[PDB]
């Protein structure tokens, strides 16, 4: 049985800049966690009612955490700080996106600064590109040489998830399932 419980029922999720990917192959897919869903469900290139009748070579399970106002970017042909600098989906993305409000899990009263996201990057991310570099971003004309100052900022910032914030600033756990010998039936 394909390990879908380990991805959705995970106690701790990864940051969007360092999104985790679970390579799932050679298994029987008990489509039930996505088959029926406070659960958002966006599919691209494939129908869910036809997933039980299709065999795939590999199925990738990408999981991370963003805020509510950024879930709209986890889609093909989207731009923004999350899409361009954290997690990008290709234009011909074949798969589904799942996201749910996790304000009762990833938000502390004193702020949950554990989840991070990438602010600055010299160029946009390619589809399915993961950049965990923490080099001081050079914005100006002078070099930085690992110095945090003017025009040389940390490329990562914290989300600070507090439960008293609006829905657009509450944590949302996202699970992106990509459908690529066909073994995942």
């Amino acid at each position, epitope marked *: 049985l394909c390990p879908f419980d380990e991805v959705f029922n995970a106690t701790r999720f990864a940051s969007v800049y360092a999104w985790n990917r679970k390579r799932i192959s050679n298994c029987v897919a008990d489509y039930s966690v996505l088959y029926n869903l406070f659960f958002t469900f966006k599919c691209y290139g494939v129908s869910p009612t036809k997933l039980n009748d299709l065999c795939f070579t590999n199925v990738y399970a990408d999981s991370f955490v963003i805020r509510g*106002d950024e879930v709209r970017q986890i889609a093909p042909g989207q*731009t*923004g*700080n999350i899409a361009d600098y954290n997690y990008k989906l290709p234009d011909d993305f074949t798969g589904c996106v799942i996201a749910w409000n996790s304000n009762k899990l990833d938000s502390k009263v004193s702020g949950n600064y554990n989840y991070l996201y990438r*602010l*600055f990057r010299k160029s946009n991310l390619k589809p399915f590109e993961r950049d965990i570099s923490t080099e001081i971003y050079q*914005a*100006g004309n002078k070099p930085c040489n690992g*110095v*945090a*100052g*003017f*025009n*040389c*900022y*940390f490329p990562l*910032r914290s989300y600070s998830f507090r439960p008293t914030y609006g829905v657009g600033h509450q944590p949302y756990r996202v699970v992106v399932l990509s459908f690529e010998p066909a073994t995942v039936c």
Partner: antibody, heavy 123, light 108 residues
Framework: QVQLVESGGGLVQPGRSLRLSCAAS????????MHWVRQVPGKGLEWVSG????????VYADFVKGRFTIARDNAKNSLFLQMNSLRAEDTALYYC????????????????WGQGTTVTVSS | AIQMTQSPSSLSASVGDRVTITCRTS??????LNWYQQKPGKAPKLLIY???SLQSGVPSRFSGSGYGTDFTLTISSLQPEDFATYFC?????????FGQGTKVEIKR
């Protein structure tokens, strides 16, 4: 409350010098970058200079060249701007601004502004 | 440099109207555009930072949007006390240049 107050403005002949001060209260001055912003009578805001919390990062707009010098005294919760070789186009009301984003991130905004001090360069 | 061009330079609207101010950048500044409000004879006050984040204490009728270029400030319901001058200011690269400003007037 958070508060900033500028001082030191007044008349100065062209070519002479003037020293501006900015007194801060109601927040941890040592943790935030500070800025100088000016405004020509009738024109828009113009950024002048900024300085990091530990003074390790110091900047000037090109119209400043090597005439002005920004500095701060974290023990006295004061920001300073030493203005030399003042010209007629330096006539403006000068604001002192605190940066919202804590520590070494000056890419968000100035939440707190003083009432400003007026500098007029004329013979 | 990072020239900031605002449009319009001046506008006249009544109480309750929806006002939208446009701010363009000479190059991409990602999402670090800031909006400020300034009354005649008063100091500027921060409204929006990081293109869309509302500053604490600012009424919810103010809202910002945009990414890269062509940023927009929106006042959903104009009130009498919104008469001022609205500046946009990029924070991607030094100098933290300001826009030319958009003076909002009210009619009665």
């Amino acid at each position: 409350q958070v508060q900033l107050v500028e001082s030191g403005g007044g008349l100065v002949q062209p070519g002479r010098s003037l020293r501006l001060s900015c007194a801060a209260s109601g927040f941890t001055f040592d943790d935030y970058a500070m800025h100088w912003v000016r405004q020509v009578p009738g024109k828009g805001l113009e950024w002048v200079s900024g300085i990091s919390w530990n003074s390790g990062s110091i900047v000037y707009a090109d119209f400043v060249k090597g005439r002005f010098t920004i500095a701060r005294d974290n023990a006295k919760n004061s920001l300073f701007l030493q203005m030399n070789s003042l010209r007629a186009e330096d006539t403006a009301l000068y604001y002192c601004a605190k940066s919202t984003a804590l520590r070494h991130q000056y890419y968000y905004g100035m939440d707190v502004w003083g009432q400003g001090t007026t500098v007029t360069v004329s013979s | 440099a990072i020239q900031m061009t605002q449009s319009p330079s001046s506008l006249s609207a009544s109480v309750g109207d929806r006002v939208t101010i446009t701010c363009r950048t000479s190059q991409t500044i990602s999402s670090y555009l800031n909006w400020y409000q300034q009354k005649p004879g008063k100091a500027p006050k921060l409204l929006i930072y990081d293109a869309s984040s509302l500053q604490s204490g600012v009424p919810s009728r103010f809202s910002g949007s945009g990414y890269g270029t062509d940023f927009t400030l929106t006042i959903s319901s104009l009130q009498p006390e919104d008469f001022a001058t609205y500046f946009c200011q990029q924070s991607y690269n030094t100098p933290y240049a300001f826009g030319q400003g958009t003076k909002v007037e009210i009619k009665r």
